[PDB]
Amino acid sequence: RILTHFYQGIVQQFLVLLTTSSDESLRFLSFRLDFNEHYKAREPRL
Amino acid sequence: LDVLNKKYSLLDHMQAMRRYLLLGQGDFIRHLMDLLKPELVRPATTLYQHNLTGILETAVRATNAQFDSPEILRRLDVRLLEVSPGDTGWDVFSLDYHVDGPIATVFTRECMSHYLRVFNFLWRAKRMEYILTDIRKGHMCNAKLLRNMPEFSGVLHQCHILASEMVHFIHQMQYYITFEV
Amino acid sequence: REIITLQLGQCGNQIGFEFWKQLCAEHGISPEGIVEEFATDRKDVFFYQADDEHYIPRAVLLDLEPRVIHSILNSPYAKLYNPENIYLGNNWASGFSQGEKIHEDIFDIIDREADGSDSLEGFVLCHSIAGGTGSGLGSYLLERLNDRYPKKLVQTYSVFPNQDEDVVVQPYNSLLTLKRLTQNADCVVVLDNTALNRIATDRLHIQNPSFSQINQLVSTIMSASTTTLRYPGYMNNDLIGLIASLIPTPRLHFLMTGYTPLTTDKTTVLDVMRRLLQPKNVMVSTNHCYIAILNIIQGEVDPTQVHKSLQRIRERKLANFIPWGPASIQVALSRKSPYLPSAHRVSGLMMANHTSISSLFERTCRQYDKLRKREAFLEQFRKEDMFKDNFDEMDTSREIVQQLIDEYHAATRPDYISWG
Amino acid sequence: REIITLQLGQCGNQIGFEFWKQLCAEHGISPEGIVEEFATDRKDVFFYQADDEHYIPRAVLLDLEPRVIHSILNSPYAKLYNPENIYLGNNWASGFSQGEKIHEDIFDIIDREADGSDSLEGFVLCHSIAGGTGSGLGSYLLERLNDRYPKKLVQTYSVFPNQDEDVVVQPYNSLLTLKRLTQNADCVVVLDNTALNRIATDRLHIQNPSFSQINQLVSTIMSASTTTLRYPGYMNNDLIGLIASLIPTPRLHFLMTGYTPLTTDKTTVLDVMRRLLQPKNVMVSTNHCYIAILNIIQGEVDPTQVHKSLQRIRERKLANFIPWGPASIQVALSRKSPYLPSAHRVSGLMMANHTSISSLFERTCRQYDKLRKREAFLEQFRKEDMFKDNFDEMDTSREIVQQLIDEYHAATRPDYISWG
Amino acid sequence: KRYFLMDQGDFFVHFMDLAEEELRKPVEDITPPRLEALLELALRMSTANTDPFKDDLKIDLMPHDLITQALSGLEAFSFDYIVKWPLSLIINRKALTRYQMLFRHM
Structure with a gap:
């Protein structure tokens, strides 16, 4: 469970670091990986 | 741009660039790492270049680049980088696709150095995709070999969902590289 | 890597025959x-580079009361594949017992072709659920394959037994076969006979030759699903990668079939995406929500089209989501095959894990429960009595399929830290 | 947005057949x-972009004692529309009761096509008032549609039952259907059978095939009314905008039909405006005053022509006014359709809310009152007795239509702060 | 003329019905990519898809048209037309600015 929560809390930061980026090109990755917004509408997951 | 196109071929080498160096072939890149897996998960201490060069031929013949012209298979070459303490197998090994002749005015030396700087990162990602499929493989094997008691269910199911968290992340990232980059 | 395809029963040999003919015309x-x-390309996925300059497919030819297999024998596609391994009904118990007594030499046939190819990725079973000929023998061979080789993949292309049907032991046979499918398979591809029947009676006005046209449909789907393996891409040049994303857990491994043209007898990715997401371009016909969808497209695809199409699919929300996580429809691009007919130049197919198949499962469970409560529809088959005098395997299969329905409904929930 | 058209009864399937053939020839x-x-243009208003490259219209095919529907079956326009939903008289009570017992699966048919289109604007009912086959089932389905979906529009193209007619229960049937029309519909388009019969016997010298020629007229009117939706303009690209101006209140929702050529078998807007305003270019034949008129024109219209034509219409005063407010004839311009015959190049139609239809209503009420006072013309229909042994629905419908006549006469007054 | 002056009213009947909720939110709340994507959906439903010039439908948010001679996404929303080099002698920046207000009014 700690392994799970650690992984999810890394992905939470990874996704919000792809929407503060320069150039649309790298923002496109952030949508493919997180489609549902079951993760990221705030700093913890949903 | 006629005579150089009919005595050598800048188009074929630039297409083979994407396949051999930028992993674009796909069929060959799976088999080549299914043979070179044990030597790569070893450090660069028991590796010497000639051994790993020999391995390539079997996989090229085995997959479908055997109908290619022999020239673009000869121009494909293996290297083994600098050995110094701190060795591993995915920071010291490289594939390469050299350019010799009057066709090397399309690429500078620095351009190929950058085409190798991309390669090591691509090779890392390609490796991780097989480590996770080994995980997924073992999940499938171990919910139909050891399942005779219901005592295993919690730990088993929990690891399975933990895998599927990584699977949709990495698989789709490998698709992103693929259809955009 | 390399796939060894297994065909058995009259319906299974029929669909394998049409699939081999389709790949013969294709390559x-x-x-x-x-x-x-x-x-x-690649011609080493279903084909061995065989030793008379014919790319002979690695196919296991099994016959049980052969009628159409005799027609397969005197055929020009019997010069394409025949490694000479043909070895000899209307019940699951009869086919199971007949497969039980001769498992040795047919396992030697499996061993011969396993030694035949250099590498192996999976075993694709041409199978018909409660088809009589395929039934029982297919479930027993599924047990033999998954027990004997735990390191490989098992795929079972399966039909759902509803053909507007007389056989009343068919729910018992389908229930026992489904127990084997849930327990002895890594992935199952399921189709509905009634759905393909409706689509066929829609697109043409055929009523009698429905079998052969359904064979055309499943062979086209089977070629379309392995196009990404047969033609080198970047991902799903092995089976397990395509199998991985749709299947989140070893119990939910049953996949819906979609393919966006129902026609082969201008277009963009955007239109065929929105045309794919309806449940009436699906060839398998409360809250029902997909676990994961994967779509593969083949054609003259502009790479910006998949991008803005997936934009439209997001903000329209025309796909059913997964509560417990992200696992969504994934865009895959594949090469257009040589010598395929030039209609629907941009053509895509989808494979998806949906909870809606639980409804079809519980319908067949309800049919079994009705005939089992009445106790007049076992018909006293002698192989069914001699195989199990107590008929406790029906109870065990009912328990397993009930656990399957409960796990389906639990995956439907926003919590899947609650199991079944 | 998108319109799903419903057709039922032999007369309703007849007018839907001719309308679909008309739109097939038009587009x-x-x-x-x-x-x-x-x-x-637009080909997504009545048409789904359907899945064999045929723009298949979303039409619900309903049959009740089919005779002409069999002729619709073996037809080249059965390849245009057939989503395969055909499911099975001379009385309102029989059609009502038959529709009552099977409302579930026909509601599932409605649900299927409601899931079929992406958007929805309204339900257009091909209906015949006291047509026997259409009657009863149409009123019951009107109750089902308006109860089940309160967020959409209901349109009913209706005839007025006077064909120079033997059926003596026809005033009872028309009275009950009119109760349903007033209470369970958002808007009703009404035509007179005798008016179209007079116009047809005028323009030609036909006496026997009056039905088919009337079908040509209503299909041309139905295409003309939805031309502004099918071809993108600026307003009335949705139904509710055209419905809004003519209907001032939920009780007066019955619209007269006008169309200025009675001919299709040079011209300016000014002449066709003054030709439209007479009550003998109206296809529906004390102080009688329109509530609101709306005219839509299609052709090679100079934009100054509508301007000075409306000038002439004002200072001539050839239209009947509304006391309690402004609500007048509105000029709308639409595109000339491709592949329409080149006669009357400037052609307009009108839809208008007039109090003169109260006269036709009270005439039919007087016929009902006569047969009801005599008590010899119920004929003791068994479905009429079993449906209502006390026949209080006839009294309730009489009360509702009396309130309707009173509200009509109250809207005629300069005060409509006096109600009924 | 086709979009601002509304020769297509089919390019709008989808779009108003589809985006009535997501426009009514405040202008600062609404993000710019969401508008453009929904616009492409309604562009494909419309027959302005068969018009080759539909590739100049963009996003520009504007403060008000009741200032000199909005606060929500509707009436702040505008399109931005982009033209080629020899079309500066007819189509102008001042003309683009004046066209935008006309659309917002309607």
């Missing part, structure tokens, strides 16, 4: 196997 | 649905 080979001059 | 499609090379 550059004659019905003898003679090489063509137009053939980024 | 660039074959009777199979094959695309043409000449087709600012």
Whole structure:
């Protein structure tokens, strides 16, 4: 469970670091990986 | 741009660039790492270049680049980088696709150095995709070999969902590289 | 890597025959196997580079009361594949017992072709659920394959037994076979006979030759699903990668079939995406929500089209989501095959894990429960009595399929830290 | 947005058949649905972009004692529309009771096509008032549609039952259906059978095939009314905008039909405006005053012509006014359709809310009152007795239509702060 | 003329019905990519898809048209037309600015 929560809390930061980026090109990755917004509408997951 | 196109071929080498160096072939890149897996998960201490060069031929013949012209298979070459303490197998090994002749005015030396700087990162990602499929493989094997008691269910199911968290992340990232980059 | 395809039963040999004929017409080979001059490809996935310059497919030919298999024998596609391994009904118990007594030499046949190819990725079973001939023997061979080789993949292309049907032991046979499918398989591809029947009676006005046209449909789907393995891409050049994303857990491994043209007898990715997401371009016909969808497209695809199409699919929300996580429809691009007919130049197919198949399962469970409560529809089959005098395997299969329905409904929930 | 058209009864399936044939000839499609090379338009209002490259209309095919529907079956326009939903008289009570017992699966048919289109604007009912086959089932389905979906529009193209007629229960049937029309519909388009009969016996010298020629008239009117939706303009590209101005209140929702050529078998807007305003170019034949008129014109219209024509219409005063407010004839301009015959190049139609239809209502009420006072013309229909042994629905419908007549006469007054 | 002056009213009947909720939110709340994507959906439903010039439908948010001679996404929303080099002698920046207000009014 700690392994799970650690992984999810890394992905939470990874996704919000792809929407503060320069150039649309790298923002496109952030949508493919997180489609549902079951993760990221705030700093913890949903 | 006629005579150089009919005595050598800048188009074929630039297409083979994407396949051999930028992993674009796909069929060959799976088999080549299914043979070179044990030597790569070893450090660069028991590796010497000639051994790993020999391995390539079997996989090229085995997959479908055997109908290619022999020239673009000869121009494909293996290297083994600098050995110094701190060795591993995915920071010291490289594939390469050299350019010799009057066709090397399309690429500078620095351009190929950058085409190798991309390669090591691509090779890392390609490796991780097989480590996770080994995980997924073992999940499938171990919910139909050891399942005779219901005592295993919690730990088993929990690891399975933990895998599927990584699977949709990495698989789709490998698709992103693929259809955009 | 390399796939060894297994075909058994009259319906299974029928769909394998049409699939092999389809791949013969698709790739550059004659019905003898003679090489063509137009053939980024691979001809080593279903085909061995065999030893008379015919790319002979690795196919296990099994016959049980052969009628149509005799027609397969005197055929020009019998010069394409025959490694000479043909070895000899209307019940699951009869086919199971007949497969039980002769498992040795047919396992030697499996061993021969396993030694035949250099590498192996999976075993694809041409199977018909409660088809009589395929039934029982298919479930027993599924047990033999998954027990004997735990390191490989098992795939079972399966039909759902509803053909507007007389056989009343069919729910018992389908229930026992489904127990084997849930317990002895890594992945199952399921189709509905009634759905393909409705689509066929829609697109044409055929009523009598429904079998052969359904065979055309499943063979086209089977070629379309393995196009990404047969033609080198970047991902799903092995089976397990395509199998991985749709299947989140070893119990939910049953996949819906979609393919966006129902026609082959201008277009963009955006239109065929929105045309794919309806449940009436699905060839398998409370809250029902997909676990994961994967779509593969083949054609003259502009790479910006998949991008803005997936934009539209997001903000329209025309796909059913997964509560417990992200696992969504994934865009895959594949090569257009040589010598395929030039209609629907941009053509896509989808494979998806949906909870809606639980409804079809519980319908067949309800049919079994009705005939089991009445106790007048076992018909006293002698192989059914001698195989199990107590008929506790029906109870065990009912328990397993009930656990399956409960796990389906639990995956439907926003919590899947609650199991079944 | 998108319109789903419902057709039922022999007369309703007749007018739907001719309307679909008219829109097939109008737009660039074959009777199979094959695309043409000449087709600012839209083909998504009555048509789904359907899945064999035929723009198949979303039509609900209902049959009740089918005779002409069999002729619709073996037809080249059965390749244009057939989503395969055909499911099975001379009385309102019989059709009502038969529709009552099977409302579930026909509601599932409605649900299927409601899931079929992406958007929805309204339900247009091909209906015949006291047509026997359409009657009863149409009123019951009207109750089902308005109860089940309160967020959409209900339109009913209706005839007025006077065909120079033997059926003596026809006033009772028309009275009950009119109760349903007043209470369970958002808007009703009403025509007179005798008016179209007079116009047809005028323009030609036909006496026997009056039905088919009337079908031509109503299909042309139905195409003309939805031309502004099918071809993108600026307003009335949705139904509710055209419905809004003519209907001032939920009780007065019955619209007269006008269309200024009675001919299709040079011209300016000014002449066709003054030709439209007479009550003998109206296809529906004390102080009688329109509530609101709306006219839509299609042709080679100079934009100054509508301007000075409306000038002339004002200072001539050839239209009947509304006391309690401004609500007048509105000029709308629409595109001339491709592949329409080139007669009357400037052609307009009108829809208007008039109090003169109260006269036709009270005439039919007087016929009902006569047969009801005599008590010899119920004929003791068994479905009429079993449906209502006390026949209080006739009294309730009489009360509702009396309130309707009173509200009509109250809207006629300069005060409509006096109600009924 | 086709979009601002509304020769297509089919390019709008989808779009108003589809985006009535997501426009009514405040202008600062609404993000710019969401508008453009929904616009492409309604562009494909419309027959302005068969018009080759539909590739100049963009996003520009504007403060008000009741200032000199909005606060929500509707009436702040505008399109931005982009033209080629020899079309500066007819189509102008001042003309683009004046066209935008006309659309917002309607």
